[PDB]
Scaffold this active site. Structure first.
Site, PDB file in Angstrom:
ATOM      1  N   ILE A  21      -3.657  -7.387   4.783  1.00 57.71           N
ATOM      2  CA  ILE A  21      -4.469  -6.184   4.979  1.00 57.71           C
ATOM      3  C   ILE A  21      -5.487  -6.101   3.861  1.00 57.71           C
ATOM      4  O   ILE A  21      -6.706  -6.066   4.076  1.00 57.71           O
ATOM      5  CB  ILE A  21      -3.627  -4.899   4.940  1.00 57.71           C
ATOM      6  N   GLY A  22      -4.977  -6.040   2.646  1.00 58.39           N
ATOM      7  CA  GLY A  22      -5.839  -5.692   1.536  1.00 58.39           C
ATOM      8  C   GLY A  22      -5.072  -5.680   0.236  1.00 58.39           C
ATOM      9  O   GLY A  22      -3.927  -6.129   0.156  1.00 58.39           O
ATOM     10  N   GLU A  23      -5.724  -5.145  -0.787  1.00 55.22           N
ATOM     11  CA  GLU A  23      -5.080  -5.148  -2.080  1.00 55.22           C
ATOM     12  C   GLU A  23      -5.778  -4.137  -2.970  1.00 55.22           C
ATOM     13  O   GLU A  23      -6.936  -3.772  -2.743  1.00 55.22           O
ATOM     14  CB  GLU A  23      -5.094  -6.546  -2.707  1.00 55.22           C
ATOM     15  N   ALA A  25      -5.585  -2.889  -7.433  1.00 56.23           N
ATOM     16  CA  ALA A  25      -5.581  -3.580  -8.711  1.00 56.23           C
ATOM     17  C   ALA A  25      -4.214  -4.169  -9.030  1.00 56.23           C
ATOM     18  O   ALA A  25      -4.123  -5.045  -9.900  1.00 56.23           O
ATOM     19  CB  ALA A  25      -6.031  -2.623  -9.827  1.00 56.23           C
ATOM     20  N   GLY A  27      -1.241  -4.340  -6.282  1.00 52.93           N
ATOM     21  CA  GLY A  27      -0.447  -4.831  -5.165  1.00 52.93           C
ATOM     22  C   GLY A  27      -1.280  -5.524  -4.105  1.00 52.93           C
ATOM     23  O   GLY A  27      -2.442  -5.179  -3.891  1.00 52.93           O
ATOM     24  N   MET A  28      -0.650  -6.477  -3.426  1.00 57.49           N
ATOM     25  CA  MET A  28      -1.192  -7.159  -2.261  1.00 57.49           C
ATOM     26  C   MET A  28      -0.421  -6.682  -1.040  1.00 57.49           C
ATOM     27  O   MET A  28       0.813  -6.720  -1.040  1.00 57.49           O
ATOM     28  CB  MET A  28      -1.042  -8.673  -2.430  1.00 57.49           C
ATOM     29  N   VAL A  29      -1.132  -6.215  -0.016  1.00 59.13           N
ATOM     30  CA  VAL A  29      -0.511  -5.518   1.103  1.00 59.13           C
ATOM     31  C   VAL A  29      -0.732  -6.314   2.374  1.00 59.13           C
ATOM     32  O   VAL A  29      -1.861  -6.738   2.661  1.00 59.13           O
ATOM     33  CB  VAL A  29      -1.061  -4.086   1.253  1.00 59.13           C
ATOM     34  N   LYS A  44       3.967  -4.020   0.497  1.00 56.83           N
ATOM     35  CA  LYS A  44       3.203  -4.185  -0.744  1.00 56.83           C
ATOM     36  C   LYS A  44       4.010  -5.026  -1.740  1.00 56.83           C
ATOM     37  O   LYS A  44       5.115  -4.640  -2.136  1.00 56.83           O
ATOM     38  CB  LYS A  44       2.847  -2.828  -1.361  1.00 56.83           C
ATOM     39  N   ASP A 139      -4.491  10.532  -8.940  1.00 53.96           N
ATOM     40  CA  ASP A 139      -5.411   9.430  -8.654  1.00 53.96           C
ATOM     41  C   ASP A 139      -5.911   9.467  -7.217  1.00 53.96           C
ATOM     42  O   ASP A 139      -6.063   8.420  -6.571  1.00 53.96           O
ATOM     43  CB  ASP A 139      -4.763   8.075  -8.943  1.00 53.96           C
TER      44      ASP A 139
HETATM   45  N1  ANP Z   1       1.250   1.531   4.263  1.00 51.27           N
HETATM   46  C1  ANP Z   1       0.044   0.964   4.329  1.00 51.27           C
HETATM   47  N2  ANP Z   1      -0.483   0.672   5.548  1.00 51.27           N
HETATM   48  C2  ANP Z   1      -1.691   0.100   5.604  1.00 51.27           C
HETATM   49  N3  ANP Z   1      -2.509  -0.234   4.595  1.00 51.27           N
HETATM   50  C3  ANP Z   1      -1.960   0.065   3.408  1.00 51.27           C
HETATM   51  C4  ANP Z   1      -0.725   0.649   3.194  1.00 51.27           C
HETATM   52  N4  ANP Z   1      -0.487   0.802   1.834  1.00 51.27           N
HETATM   53  C5  ANP Z   1      -1.565   0.316   1.273  1.00 51.27           C
HETATM   54  N5  ANP Z   1      -2.501  -0.140   2.162  1.00 51.27           N
HETATM   55  C6  ANP Z   1      -3.771  -0.761   1.843  1.00 51.27           C
HETATM   56  O1  ANP Z   1      -3.602  -1.482   0.633  1.00 51.27           O
HETATM   57  C7  ANP Z   1      -4.522  -0.993  -0.370  1.00 51.27           C
HETATM   58  C8  ANP Z   1      -3.881  -1.100  -1.736  1.00 51.27           C
HETATM   59  O2  ANP Z   1      -2.743  -0.178  -1.787  1.00 51.27           O
HETATM   60  P1  ANP Z   1      -2.366   0.667  -3.099  1.00 51.27           P
HETATM   61  O3  ANP Z   1      -1.057   1.300  -2.800  1.00 51.27           O
HETATM   62  O4  ANP Z   1      -3.503   1.613  -3.473  1.00 51.27           O
HETATM   63  O5  ANP Z   1      -2.163  -0.506  -4.168  1.00 51.27           O
HETATM   64  P2  ANP Z   1      -2.111  -0.542  -5.747  1.00 51.27           P
HETATM   65  O6  ANP Z   1      -2.646  -1.930  -6.211  1.00 51.27           O
HETATM   66  O7  ANP Z   1      -0.688  -0.414  -6.180  1.00 51.27           O
HETATM   67  N6  ANP Z   1      -2.921   0.713  -6.577  1.00 51.27           N
HETATM   68  P3  ANP Z   1      -4.623   0.880  -6.559  1.00 51.27           P
HETATM   69  O8  ANP Z   1      -5.341  -0.174  -7.485  1.00 51.27           O
HETATM   70  O9  ANP Z   1      -4.877   2.305  -6.980  1.00 51.27           O
HETATM   71  O10 ANP Z   1      -5.105   0.661  -5.065  1.00 51.27           O
HETATM   72  C9  ANP Z   1      -4.885   0.412   0.102  1.00 51.27           C
HETATM   73  O11 ANP Z   1      -6.138   0.856  -0.417  1.00 51.27           O
HETATM   74  C10 ANP Z   1      -4.903   0.243   1.627  1.00 51.27           C
HETATM   75  O12 ANP Z   1      -6.119  -0.326   2.107  1.00 51.27           O
END
Ligand code: ANP
Ligand code: E2A
Length: 349
Positions: A21-23, A25, A27-29, A44, A139
């Protein structure tokens, strides 16, 4: 184990068919299929144990999201990690699958007033529950507002969340060094303490402004440029505004800037609903003590067609962490993460 963009995702055999999907800073999702429950999920992957601050984010997110239960807040369904602490290097957080986020949506699409109104309502409905538990998200931004095919919205990304306690909390500075500051309240950049629920309302106002124009309203490169963006629209702070700055060096800094006239909201948003701009004005107020509160915002005439307190649930009791984490070494935080995730392991007793 399955591989996504050259990254190991060691989540089988229960979870299969992974797709990036995406990521952010940290996590990779991926999306995945849960073969046990026969449902689609998001997963994630984070790898936090070499960094105290990443360990803080992981433990805060896990503890809070497992205690929250609300339609506008993402849930945690499962957590995968190694059976021994020595082997634990990655953590996989399994969540309900959403389709996109507001950041990606605004890049391709202009929103109608009805969509803006509905998204804003759902944000505040989720925020009402968060604040009723005495928690600050800290945030909020378009990229952690998730959306599904049916236009449902869920807040995610609780790694900076904290229990509200302005008089007795000493979080200090937001030890976040990789993500965006365009949604941060001015008192965060001016003070290192005394953060209240009003910081989240500021963030929501910034998000409202961006839904109205498809551009961020205060896109600075650093705190210095960021403050100049804010003051360039709000104008120079009033006398009463100055009295709410605690750090005298910060107040003397603001006093040294040249005078700036306020810019009317309808110069920036000439085609916007007047009721939207009235609520925007009350959310983007410099003085956090005069900023509108979440329940007052839900009751604002802009949100009239959706407001329903009978169907806007709250938390049963304010959340508590049961300890402070800022001074623990990352080795101790790793133990706490192991303990908090043991309820997802076979044989937990
Ligand atoms: N449950 C989910 N379903 C679909 N997409 C998701 C989901 N959780 C996260 N994503 C996608 O993954 C991206 C990164 O998730 P996030 O939880 O913000 O990661 P992070 O690296 O821990 N923190 P941050 O750097 O603030 O984004 C999000 O901006 C969404 O695009
Ligand atoms: C939601 C979707 C849609 O048609 O929603 C209808 C609606 C009308 C009034 C108030 C609230 C919703 C749409 O067409 C744009 C896509 C959107 C934003 C969505 O699916 O999000 C991913």
């Amino acid at each position: 184990p399955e591989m996504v963009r050259g990254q190991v995702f060691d989540v089988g055999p229960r979870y299969t068919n992974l797709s990036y999907i995406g990521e952010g800073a940290y996590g990779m999702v991926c999306s995945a299929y849960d073969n046990v429950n026969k449902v689609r999920v998001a997963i994630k992957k984070i790898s936090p144990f070499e960094h105290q601050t990443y360990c803080q984010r992981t433990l805060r997110e896990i503890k809070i999201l497992l205690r929250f239960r609300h339609e506008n807040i993402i849930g945690i369904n499962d957590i995968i990690r190694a059976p021994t602490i020595e082997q634990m290097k990655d953590v996989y957080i399994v969540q309900d699958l959403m389709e996109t986020d507001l950041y990606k949506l605004l890049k391709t699409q202009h929103l109608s007033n009805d969509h803006i109104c509905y998204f804003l309502y759902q944000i505040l409905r989720g925020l009402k529950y968060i604040h009723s538990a005495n928690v600050l998200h800290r945030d909020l931004k378009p990229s952690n507002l998730l959306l599904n095919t049916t236009c449902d919205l869920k807040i995610c990304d609780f790694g900076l969340a904290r229990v509200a306690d302005p008089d007795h909390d000493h979080t200090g500075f937001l030890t976040e060094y990789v993500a965006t500051r365009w949604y941060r309240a001015p008192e965060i950049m001016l003070n290192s303490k005394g953060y209240t629920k009003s910081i989240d309302i500021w963030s929501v106002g910034c998000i409202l402004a961006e839904m109205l124009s498809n551009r961020p309203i205060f896109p600075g490169k650093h705190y210095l440029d960021q403050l100049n963006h804010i003051l360039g629209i709000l104008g120079s702070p009033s006398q009463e505004d100055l009295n709410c700055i605690i750090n005298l060096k910060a107040r003397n800094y603001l006093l040294s800037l040249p005078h700036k006239n306020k810019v009317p909201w309808n110069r920036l948003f000439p085609n916007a609903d007047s009721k939207a701009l009235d609520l925007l004005d009350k959310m983007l107020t410099f003085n956090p003590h005069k900023r509108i509160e979440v329940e007052q915002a839900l009751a604002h005439p802009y949100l009239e067609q959706y407001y329903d307190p009978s169907d806007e649930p709250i938390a049963e009791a304010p959340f508590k962490f049961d300890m402070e984490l800022d001074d623990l070494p990352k080795e101790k935080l790793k133990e706490l993460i192991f303990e908090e995730t043991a309820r997802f392991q076979p044989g937990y007793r």
